[PDB]
PDB file of all heavy atoms in Angstrom:
ATOM      1  N   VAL B4035      47.526  79.823 156.417  1.00 40.19           N
ATOM      2  CA  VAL B4035      48.323  78.962 155.702  1.00 40.19           C
ATOM      3  C   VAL B4035      47.671  77.577 155.613  1.00 40.19           C
ATOM      4  O   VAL B4035      47.692  76.922 154.502  1.00 40.19           O
ATOM      5  CB  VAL B4035      49.786  78.881 156.262  1.00 40.19           C
ATOM      6  CG1 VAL B4035      50.579  77.817 155.457  1.00 40.19           C
ATOM      7  CG2 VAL B4035      50.386  80.302 156.278  1.00 40.19           C
ATOM      8  N   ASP B4036      47.055  77.117 156.660  1.00 36.91           N
ATOM      9  CA  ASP B4036      46.350  75.752 156.627  1.00 36.91           C
ATOM     10  C   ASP B4036      45.160  75.869 155.698  1.00 36.91           C
ATOM     11  O   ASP B4036      44.811  74.946 154.998  1.00 36.91           O
ATOM     12  CB  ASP B4036      45.988  75.382 158.073  1.00 36.91           C
ATOM     13  CG  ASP B4036      47.200  75.166 158.941  1.00 36.91           C
ATOM     14  OD1 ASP B4036      48.344  75.215 158.406  1.00 36.91           O
ATOM     15  OD2 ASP B4036      46.968  74.826 160.138  1.00 36.91           O
ATOM     16  N   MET B4037      44.340  76.994 155.732  1.00 36.73           N
ATOM     17  CA  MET B4037      43.335  77.318 154.807  1.00 36.73           C
ATOM     18  C   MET B4037      43.940  77.241 153.462  1.00 36.73           C
ATOM     19  O   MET B4037      43.238  76.622 152.510  1.00 36.73           O
ATOM     20  CB  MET B4037      43.036  78.774 155.114  1.00 36.73           C
ATOM     21  CG  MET B4037      41.635  79.119 154.668  1.00 36.73           C
ATOM     22  SD  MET B4037      41.587  79.466 152.908  1.00 36.73           S
ATOM     23  CE  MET B4037      42.200  81.267 153.012  1.00 36.73           C
ATOM     24  N   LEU B4038      45.096  77.858 153.006  1.00 37.85           N
ATOM     25  CA  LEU B4038      45.504  77.802 151.633  1.00 37.85           C
ATOM     26  C   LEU B4038      45.993  76.300 151.242  1.00 37.85           C
ATOM     27  O   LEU B4038      45.690  75.919 150.105  1.00 37.85           O
ATOM     28  CB  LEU B4038      46.797  78.729 151.566  1.00 37.85           C
ATOM     29  CG  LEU B4038      46.522  80.273 151.601  1.00 37.85           C
ATOM     30  CD1 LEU B4038      47.653  81.080 151.402  1.00 37.85           C
ATOM     31  CD2 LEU B4038      45.315  80.654 150.796  1.00 37.85           C
ATOM     32  N   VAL B4039      46.514  75.567 152.143  1.00 37.07           N
ATOM     33  CA  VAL B4039      46.924  74.162 151.817  1.00 37.07           C
ATOM     34  C   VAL B4039      45.654  73.346 151.797  1.00 37.07           C
ATOM     35  O   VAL B4039      45.735  72.225 151.140  1.00 37.07           O
ATOM     36  CB  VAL B4039      48.096  73.618 152.800  1.00 37.07           C
ATOM     37  CG1 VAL B4039      49.075  74.670 152.903  1.00 37.07           C
ATOM     38  CG2 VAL B4039      47.371  73.234 154.036  1.00 37.07           C
ATOM     39  N   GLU B4040      44.654  73.692 152.380  1.00 36.47           N
ATOM     40  CA  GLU B4040      43.344  72.930 152.274  1.00 36.47           C
ATOM     41  C   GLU B4040      42.643  73.297 150.887  1.00 36.47           C
ATOM     42  O   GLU B4040      42.095  72.373 150.276  1.00 36.47           O
ATOM     43  CB  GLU B4040      42.367  73.331 153.536  1.00 36.47           C
ATOM     44  CG  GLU B4040      40.875  72.869 153.252  1.00 36.47           C
ATOM     45  CD  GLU B4040      40.793  71.463 153.420  1.00 36.47           C
ATOM     46  OE1 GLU B4040      41.779  70.605 153.829  1.00 36.47           O
ATOM     47  OE2 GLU B4040      39.585  70.829 153.344  1.00 36.47           O
ATOM     48  N   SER B4041      42.618  74.432 150.525  1.00 37.22           N
ATOM     49  CA  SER B4041      42.143  75.011 149.275  1.00 37.22           C
ATOM     50  C   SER B4041      43.157  75.231 148.234  1.00 37.22           C
ATOM     51  O   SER B4041      43.092  76.084 147.448  1.00 37.22           O
ATOM     52  CB  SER B4041      41.323  76.226 149.485  1.00 37.22           C
ATOM     53  OG  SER B4041      42.032  77.252 150.021  1.00 37.22           O
ATOM     54  N   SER B4042      44.159  74.231 148.084  1.00 36.15           N
ATOM     55  CA  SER B4042      45.375  74.504 147.263  1.00 36.15           C
ATOM     56  C   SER B4042      44.869  74.484 145.865  1.00 36.15           C
ATOM     57  O   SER B4042      45.284  75.402 145.091  1.00 36.15           O
ATOM     58  CB  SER B4042      46.298  73.196 147.445  1.00 36.15           C
ATOM     59  OG  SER B4042      46.999  73.410 148.756  1.00 36.15           O
ATOM     60  N   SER B4043      44.065  73.460 145.348  1.00 35.76           N
ATOM     61  CA  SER B4043      43.682  73.397 144.029  1.00 35.76           C
ATOM     62  C   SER B4043      42.920  74.687 143.539  1.00 35.76           C
ATOM     63  O   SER B4043      43.190  75.191 142.402  1.00 35.76           O
ATOM     64  CB  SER B4043      42.827  72.246 143.728  1.00 35.76           C
ATOM     65  OG  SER B4043      43.426  71.135 144.142  1.00 35.76           O
ATOM     66  N   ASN B4044      42.042  75.269 144.330  1.00 32.94           N
ATOM     67  CA  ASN B4044      41.262  76.353 143.940  1.00 32.94           C
ATOM     68  C   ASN B4044      42.231  77.628 143.768  1.00 32.94           C
ATOM     69  O   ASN B4044      42.111  78.411 142.902  1.00 32.94           O
ATOM     70  CB  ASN B4044      40.189  76.683 145.003  1.00 32.94           C
ATOM     71  CG  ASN B4044      39.352  75.459 145.357  1.00 32.94           C
ATOM     72  OD1 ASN B4044      39.421  74.469 144.704  1.00 32.94           O
ATOM     73  ND2 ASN B4044      38.614  75.611 146.380  1.00 32.94           N
TER      74      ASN B4044
END
Side-chain angles (χ1 to χ4, degrees):
Chain B
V4035 177
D4036 298 357
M4037 210 275 278
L4038 294 184
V4039 314
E4040 166 75 3
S4041 55
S4042 289
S4043 304
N4044 311 349

